[PDB]
Every structure is written in C-alpha cells, then in structure tokens.
Amino acid sequence: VPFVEDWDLVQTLGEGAYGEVQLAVNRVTEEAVAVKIVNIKKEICILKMLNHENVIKFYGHRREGNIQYLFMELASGGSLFDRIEPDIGMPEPDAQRFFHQLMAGVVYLHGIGITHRDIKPHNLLLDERDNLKIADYSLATVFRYNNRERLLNKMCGTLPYVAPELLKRREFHAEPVDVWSCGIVLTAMLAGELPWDQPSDSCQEYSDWKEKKTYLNPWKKIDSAPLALLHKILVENPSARITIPDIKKDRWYNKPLK
Numbered sequence: 678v679p680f681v682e683d684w685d686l687v688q689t690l691g692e693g694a695y696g697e698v699q700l701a702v703n704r705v706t707e708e709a710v711a712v713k714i715v716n717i718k719k720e721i722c723i724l725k726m727l728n729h730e731n732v733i734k735f736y737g738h739r740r741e742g743n744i745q746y747l748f749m750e751l752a753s754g755g756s757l758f759d760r761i762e763p764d765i766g767m768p769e770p771d772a773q774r775f776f777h778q779l780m781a782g783v784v785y786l787h788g789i790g791i792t793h794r795d796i797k798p799h800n801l802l803l804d805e806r807d808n809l810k811i812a813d814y815s816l817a818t819v820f821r822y823n824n825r826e827r828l829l830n831k832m833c834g835t836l837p838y839v840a841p842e843l844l845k846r847r848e849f850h851a852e853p854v855d856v857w858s859c860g861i862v863l864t865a866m867l868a869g870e871l872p873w874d875q876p877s878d879s880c881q882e883y884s885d886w887k888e889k890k891t892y893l894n895p896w897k898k899i900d901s902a903p904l905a906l907l908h909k910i911l912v913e914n915p916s917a918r919i920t921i922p923d924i925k926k927d928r929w930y931n932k933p934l935k
C-alpha cells in the first residue's frame with residue numbers, strides 16, 4: 678500500500694532493465710494504469726511522442742525526491758511471451774494477426790523517427806482484447822530528425838534478437854535492425870523456439886541457416902509461406918534485407934487465415 682497522489686501502487690507487474698513496474702489503481706475513479714518506478718530525461722521525451730494503438734501510451738510523470746514515476750497505459754493481458762508454447766508456437770492465424778499489429782506499431786515508430794532497439798516477446802504486451810502494444814522505451818532512440826538519418830553505433834538489445842550487423846559494424850542503420858528482430862519474433866511465434874543464441878558465423882545454427890538447412894528445426898516446423906517471408910527478413914546484409922513496405926506485399930502477410 679504505498680501511493681503517489683491518488684494512486685495506490687497495488688501489485689508488482691515486473692522488473693525491466695531498471696525499475697519496477699507496478700499496477701496503480703486510483704482510489705477515487707478506480708482507473709487502473711501501470712507505473713514504472715525509477716537518461717530518463719530522454720525516455721520521457723520519447724514517451725510523450727507516442728500516440729498509436731499498438732504502442733503503449735504515456736500518461737505523464739511525477740518526480741518525488743529520489744524516485745521518478747512514469748504513468749502508462751496498462752496492458753492487462755500479459756505479454757506475447759505468455760502466448761508462445763515452448764516447442765510449438767501458436768496457431769498461425771494468431772501469429773499472423775500479432776505480426777500485423779507489430780508491423781503497424783513498428784511502422785509508426787519508424788515514421789516518427791524512433792527506433793525501439795529491443796523488440797522481443799517480453800516487450801510486446803497484450804490488452805484485454807489481445808491487441809498488441811510495443812512497450813519499454815528505455816533503449817529507444819531517435820534515428821531521424823529534420824528528415825536526416827543518423828546511423829547508430831551503440832550495441833544494445835538482446836543477443837538472440839539482434840541483427841548480425843550490430844555485432845560486425847561500427848555503425849549501422851536503425852530500421853533493418855528492428856525488422857530483423859520482428860523476424861526472430863515471428864520465428865518464435867511459429868515454432869516456439871529461438872533459432873540461435875546469436876547471429877555470428879561462430880554459431881552453428883546461424884551457419885546452418887545461411888546454408889539454407891531448413892530441413893532442421895525450427896524451420897521444419899514452419900509452413901512454406903511464412904518461411905518464405907522469413908527468408909526475406911533474416912537476410913545477413915542489411916541493405917538486401919526486406920523493408921516494411923515490401924513485407925506488406927508478401928504473400929503470407931496477405932493470406933486470409935483462420
């Protein structure tokens with residue numbers, strides 16, 4: 678029962694990079710939100726930019742001495758990680774719908790010149806109608822400003838989800854990195870397993886993929902239509918990799934399902 682103004686901080690929803698996330702229920706109105714309890718300057722700044730239905734909304738913040746409190750839209754359906762059954766995945770029509778929503782959120786972000794940099798199932802939250810929302814902007818950054826792109830140079834993210842250029846290049850474009858990670862998420866949805874620990878030539882599973890050994894897992898679990906899309910996303914050269922406009926033209930992406 679701590680509190681901040683009208684909100685009771687009722688239960689922990691988890692830890693992130695830094696900072697607990699609590700469920701905050703308002704004593705008066707009964708509204709429920711999520712509150713992150715904690716560089717931060719930049720995060721808040723990016724958070725106030727966000728206005729889209731597949732992105733977690735920012736409601737405002739309050740600094741109270743030591744601790745900053747970031748109020749955000751609650752997603753009470755848990756995360757996509759909870760929907761992925763190990764070694765199985767989920768039904769292809771659920772995967773497709775979530776992938777559609779993830780692409781809508783990522784397009785939006787990239788359109789305001791923001792890169793998330795850590796797309797993975799734990800950061801993809803569901804609302805009570807199973808709508809997907811991209812959350813956690815603690816690693817997010819600006820890659821386009823006044824219509825000029827800047828390349829990134831900090832390595833960050835989560836190894837299984839990161840694009841290979843991030844481990845090999847001094848500087849790289851933001852957008853193909855976020856596309857690659859969506860590809861790994863789509864793999865996980867359809868196969869219930871990640872394909873490699875990291876995308877280095879010293880990792881055997883990655884070498885196998887580049888040699889097109891799709892008779893192996895996880896690829897053997899995936900139907901040929903989504904697998905053809907994954908062949909276009911998980912492309913090692915970032916300038917050859919498919920872009921989001923072209924993902925939206927892909928045959929599996931447009932296939933009627935369920």
Ligand SMILES: N#Cc1c[nH]c2nccc(-c3cccc(O)c3)c12
Nearest residue numbers: 690691692698711749750751752812
């Ligand atoms: N962050 C955040 C959240 C924003 N709305 C939420 N709704 C439910 C859970 C979370 C949440 C909780 C722990 C870790 C995390 O990554 C996200 C959030």
